[PDB]
Amino acid sequence: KTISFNFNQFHQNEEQLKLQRDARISSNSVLELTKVVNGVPTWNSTGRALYAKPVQVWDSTTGNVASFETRFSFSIRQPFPRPHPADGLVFFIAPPNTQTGEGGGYFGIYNPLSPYPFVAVEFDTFRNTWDPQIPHIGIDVNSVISTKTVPFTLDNGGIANVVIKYDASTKILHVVLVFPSLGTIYTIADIVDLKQVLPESVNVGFSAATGDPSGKQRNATETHDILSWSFSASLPG
Amino acid sequence: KTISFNFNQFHQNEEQLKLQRDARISSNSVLELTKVVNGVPTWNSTGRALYAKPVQVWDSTTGNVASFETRFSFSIRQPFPRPHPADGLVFFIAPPNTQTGEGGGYFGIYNPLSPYPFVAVEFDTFRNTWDPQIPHIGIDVNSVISTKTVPFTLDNGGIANVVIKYDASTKILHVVLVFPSLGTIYTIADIVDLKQVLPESVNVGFSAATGDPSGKQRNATETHDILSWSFSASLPG
Ligand SMILES: *[C@@H]1O[C@H](CO)[C@@H](O[C@@H]2O[C@H](CO)[C@@H](O)[C@H](O)[C@H]2NC(C)=O)[C@H](O[C@@H]2O[C@@H](C)[C@@H](O)[C@@H](O)[C@@H]2O)[C@H]1NC(C)=O
Ligand SMILES: *[C@@H]1O[C@H](CO)[C@@H](O[C@@H]2O[C@H](CO)[C@@H](O)[C@H](O)[C@H]2NC(C)=O)[C@H](O[C@@H]2O[C@@H](C)[C@@H](O)[C@@H](O)[C@@H]2O)[C@H]1NC(C)=O
Ligand SMILES: *[C@@H]1O[C@H](CO)[C@@H](O[C@@H]2O[C@H](CO)[C@@H](O)[C@H](O)[C@H]2NC(C)=O)[C@H](O[C@@H]2O[C@@H](C)[C@@H](O)[C@@H](O)[C@@H]2O)[C@H]1NC(C)=O
Ligand SMILES: CO[C@H]1O[C@H](CO)[C@H](O)[C@H](O)[C@H]1NC(C)=O
Ligand SMILES: CO[C@H]1O[C@H](CO)[C@H](O)[C@H](O)[C@H]1NC(C)=O
Ligand SMILES: *[C@@H]1O[C@H](CO)[C@@H](O)[C@H](O)[C@H]1NC(C)=O
Ligand SMILES: [Ca+2]
Ligand SMILES: [Ca+2]
Ligand SMILES: [Mn+2]
Ligand SMILES: [Mn+2]
């Protein structure tokens, strides 16, 4: 069992994607997770993009867990340096048919009064009380309080290439972040047992958020665009 | 407390390096692990380059194991496409004061006569009876029969950026290979317990080899140059 897809760009009314909240595909082929009006990103925005079909990460009959690899490119432009940009974007895996969670530092994937499990890779741009210096890459399991974190320097408005790989045999989730214009490379990895946190079928996708109104800073915002996205998974059992 | 070193280029007769066999430093600052005469690489070549001082990867007193990160750039030029270039290069960790092993597919780090333990990251270009398709990245522990491998496409004569990271807490060894001119990214990781395979003090370095005479093919060769190399280790205690 091998499932996979690839998007060299995105088209409006992409029957393969499920857009939620502020998520929208622009006319020039990019997936804009958060609201951007007249070339300017706004605060109080949250949006998600899920692959329409569910993927099987493990099978209870054989006990086998799937291995997978996903690559995507994104760009974050931070027009307003002061006071502070927010909030960042994440690639995540969650149960199917879920609704956008709380915005702000929760990226729209965490919902307090109805928490659902999830594994996520974050690119955090705002420092919340539970965060180390930003920006940083973090591996999140059921919480936005990363199990592992690594700092990185953003290429404002530049393109970022990300590779996320998960090997079921070792349970290692490793992510690579590369900014081709700067030649910088960041790597982070951790052990995660999908079988232990997620159900057999899940949805994979992205989620982002800009500054929350509670911060009372309209400049607390930035863009969260996805330029391309390929995904492949293999379930031997 | 712990070590750190960085070479942005190499100087003829580096007091800091221990060159063995065919390893030499060219007039223009590159470390040529295997023999290259008049711009042409030759077969039957083997060479290593070790950091002169030993590094402590773990302490028996505290039981603490070190974490480390190493980045380097290399270039492999394959002038003769047919019948098959050989053999590749590796970054390795071994006990101090060891001698060059057997060439060919053993890269000069394996010695059947008096085997010594070692952890290595290989960039295999020739397919031996124990190898999967080439080229590939492989993680080797005490043998050249990789515990884990991933295929990659070489940028002939191009520059390759490598990042090798080891986290003692998770025992995860993850390596990243990037070819900036092609924008390609390859990642591989595995669990390795240094404390269980290596002594408290070790040498770190590179080793490469070209076609062995037993193959009866003089074309079985290529260059194995190291352009730069930075290393860092952090042993708490
Ligand atoms: C919110 O973002 C605005 C756009 O970056 C900031 O205004 C810009 O502030 C610059 C000085 O840091 C100034 O040179 C720019 O001309 C100005 N841009 C314009 C025309 O709006 C804004 O900064 C506040 O407003 C400006 C006008 C000054 O009064 C600053 O002292 C203020 O901090 C940002 N506001 C905040 C809360 O950071
Ligand atoms: C492959 O490289 C080897 C390392 O230089 C060559 O070994 C020869 O070893 C001799 C003593 O062991 C030494 O005096 C020689 O300098 C050296 N090679 C020569 C002759 O320059 C090996 O050479 C072959 O094997 C040796 C034992 C001699 O019989 C040579 O005449 C052979 O050419 C190299 N093999 C080949 C096929 O090039
Ligand atoms: C070993 O590498 C040599 C250089 O790449 C090969 O020879 C070159 O082959 C080219 C076409 O394959 C030909 O246009 C070049 O002129 C020639 N260069 C030389 C050495 O004169 C060589 O290939 C064999 O020998 C050549 C001359 C041709 O006859 C080929 O058909 C032969 O396969 C390579 N040897 C092997 C075993 O591949
Ligand atoms: C004061 O914090 C809030 O506003 C910030 C931007 O001003 C950030 O958006 C920050 O994440 C958000 N906090 C939460 C919990 O959503
Ligand atoms: C036929 O195999 C041998 O020759 C090859 C090059 O022709 C390669 O050098 C290959 O690695 C080597 N084998 C060993 C075991 O070293
Ligand atoms: C934030 O957006 C929500 C829904 O998009 C809206 O109901 C709310 O009033 C907005 N907050 C402010 C103060 O703009
Ligand atoms: Ca945050
Ligand atoms: Ca080989
Ligand atoms: Mn964070
Ligand atoms: Mn191999």
From Swiss-Prot, chains A, B:
Give a single Pfam family match: Lectin_legB
Which keywords does this chain's UniProt record carry? Glycoprotein, Lectin
Query: What GO molecular function annotations does the UniProt record carry, in alphabetical order?
Result: carbohydrate binding
**In terms of domain of life, where is this protein from?**
Eukaryota
Glycosylation sites noted in the Swiss-Prot or TrEMBL record:
44, 219
Q: Which InterPro entries match?
A: ConA-like_dom_sf, L-lectin, Lectin_legB_Mn/Ca_BS, Legume_lectin_dom, Leguminous_Lectin
PROSITE patterns referenced in this protein's UniProt entry, alphabetically: LECTIN_LEGUME_BETA (PS00307)
Q: Which PANTHER family match?
A: CONCANAVALIN A-LIKE LECTIN FAMILY PROTEIN (PTHR32401), LECTIN (PTHR32401:SF45)
State the similarity comment: Belongs to the leguminous lectin family.
Functionally, this protein is described as follows: Lectin.
Q: What name is this protein filed under?
A: Basic agglutinin
Native species of this protein? Psophocarpus tetragonolobus
Q: What is the lineage of its organism?
A: Eukaryota, Viridiplantae, Streptophyta, Embryophyta, Tracheophyta
Q: Which gene encodes it?
A: WBAI
